[PDB]
Design a protein around this ligand. Structure first.
Ligand SMILES: *C1=[C@@]2(F[C]2N2[C]([C][N]C3=[C][C]=C(C(=O)[N][C]([C][C]C([O])=O)C([O])=O)[C]=[C]3)[C][N]C3=C2C(=O)[N]C([N])=N3)C(=O)[N]C(=O)N1[C]1[C][C]([O])[C]([C]OP([O])([O])=O)O1
Ligand SMILES: *C1=[C@@]2(F[C]2N2[C]([C][N]C3=[C][C]=C(C(=O)[N][C]([C][C]C([O])=O)C([O])=O)[C]=[C]3)[C][N]C3=C2C(=O)[N]C([N])=N3)C(=O)[N]C(=O)N1[C]1[C][C]([O])[C]([C]OP([O])([O])=O)O1
Lengths: 264, 264
């Protein structure tokens, strides 16, 4: 998509060489922001084929409050396999944090429910936020949250969401984080009788792994096609009730996929 | 500063009318990002004289993990007066979450110490963060962190910082926020022998309260001046050792101050 492709070119033009945890080495920039008007089309990358199945399944898994890959397996999604223990566990990652952030006083807060309630009774609130960034549990997580905190906003009968992504693998993670947050907005928007507004993505260390440079230049040589269109076929009783099947992406015609290795 | 006045103009030209919590009404935009090269001078508004002493103590108050305005008082700093209790407590706000995030099990994690250790031992790290957004203790705070979450980055011996500000008062709060974090980059940069890099500011709900329309217009017509320069007179032995006397500004020739009511 135009915005995505401009971020890539930005990394290349202004990125500095950095060593990283995975010992692979990156090209990184610090602080970026791009806006996607969800009414223009569904933000699914077209200059490379993306695997929607994996995208959706992962989010349904987040919303369930699950942190074990079994679910992901039953559905043939193996994007998290490498961080998973012998038992399929990832520790208190996203889904636990979103649905049951543990408080110091033996309580547990469901952040999605909270947000949902806020978008309905006090949408002018400047406190409509979900944080995966739970400092008391980071040491028990397979990996610390990449997409760590988000905030909603309603104005003119449109829901907007802004994401603060602390670390971003531009080639592999980014296309995934974008289509995912966008589908979240559409889902929230349906539950609250809002129209879709903007998805604004903000980044922390945004980088290209040193082993994704050729694939990067290949992609860039491609011209984006018209964005797909999301069609939700049902209105479940709760946000927690979507099924893989309620969702339909129309008009998706991307360039051929490009393989690249994930740094572990 | 040019970045600042442009944002002030943007709220006016595009903000949508919102009924806020204070009941004042505000002009609002969702999502904005500005960057400040700390190398080019300290980001202290010059189109209105800023109260540097309030900015400094507030900060030093934070680093101590103090949640009591007592200390703010002794230094004749009244900015947190209206939200404190009869005892002068605000609850586990900023100071408490920076210096002692209460874990579920009874421990406490010192996020500041952690960040120092990370900058000294693992600068390339992508998890260098401090969060004041402790979901479990939000109901205990007088008000929720406006400056929620921030993250440090190191590239080429330079230390950069990025702040996620969920709610922002362009007129009163903003200038205070920008110079407060800048000041921090500076004390961080020095205790860790790095050069200063960029200060990236990202906001959620960014607004101008409707009773600041005048002051805003008054301010929108002055020519920004050159930015001052920060001098750290001494190298304390630890970052919890700064003092007011240690900081000096130079070349701060501001336009005259502007008085404005605070929305409570
Ligand atoms: C981070 C995050 F959280 C991500 N991630 C994870 C996992 N996930 C995934 C994986 C893989 C993939 C793929 O491969 N894709 C492909 C295929 C599809 C199918 O097959 O289905 C395409 O697309 O083509 C996907 C997904 C964990 N880990 C990791 C990740 C990434 O991404 N990368 C890496 N290297 N690793 C998010 O969300 N995002 C992002 O971006 N991230 C990242 C950032 C960095 O780089 C990392 C982390 O680390 P630190 O250190 O920073 O912490 O990652
Ligand atoms: C939020 C925050 F946390 C701010 N803030 C606070 C306090 N601080 C302050 C106050 C006041 C001031 C003034 O006035 N200043 C002046 C003077 C100085 C002397 O005198 O000393 C000038 O500057 O001139 C300052 C400071 C708390 N509260 C509040 C505040 C503000 O600002 N505003 C209001 N209204 N209140 C931060 O940090 N930031 C921000 O921005 N904030 C804000 C945002 C909003 O608006 C609010 C909150 O609400 P929600 O709903 O969102 O939560 O705030």
């Amino acid at each position: 998509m135009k915005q995505y492709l401009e971020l890539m070119q930005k990394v290349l033009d202004e990125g500095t060489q950095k060593n990283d945890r995975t010992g692979t080495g990156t090209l990184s920039i610090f602080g970026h922001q791009m806006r996607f008007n969800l009414q223009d089309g569904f933000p699914l990358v077209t200059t490379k084929r993306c695997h929607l199945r994996s995208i959706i399944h992962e989010l349904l898994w987040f919303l369930q409050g699950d942190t074990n890959i079994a679910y992901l397996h039953e559905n043939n999604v193996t994007i998290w396999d490498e961080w998973a223990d012998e038992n399929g566990d990832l520790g208190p990652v996203y889904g636990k944090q979103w649905r049951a952030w543990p408080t110091p006083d033996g309580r547990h807060i469901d952040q999605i429910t909270t947000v949902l309630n806020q978008l309905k009774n006090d949408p002018d609130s400047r406190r409509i936020i979900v944080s995966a960034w739970n400092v008391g549990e980071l040491d028990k997580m397979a990996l610390a949250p990449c997409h760590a905190f988000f905030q909603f906003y309603v104005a003119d009968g449109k829901l907007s969401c802004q994401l603060y992504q602390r670390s971003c693998d531009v080639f592999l993670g980014l296309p995934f984080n974008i289509a995912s947050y966008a589908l979240l907005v559409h889902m929230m928007a349906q539950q609250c009788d809002l129209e879709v507004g903007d998805f604004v993505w903000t980044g922390g260390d945004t980088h290209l792994y040193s082993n994704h440079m050729d694939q990067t230049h290949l992609q860039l040589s491609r011209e984006p096609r018209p964005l797909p269109k999301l069609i939700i076929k049902r209105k479940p009783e709760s946000i927690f009730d979507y099924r893989f099947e309620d969702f339909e992406i129309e008009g998706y015609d991307p360039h051929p996929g490009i393989k690249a290795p994930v740094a572990i």
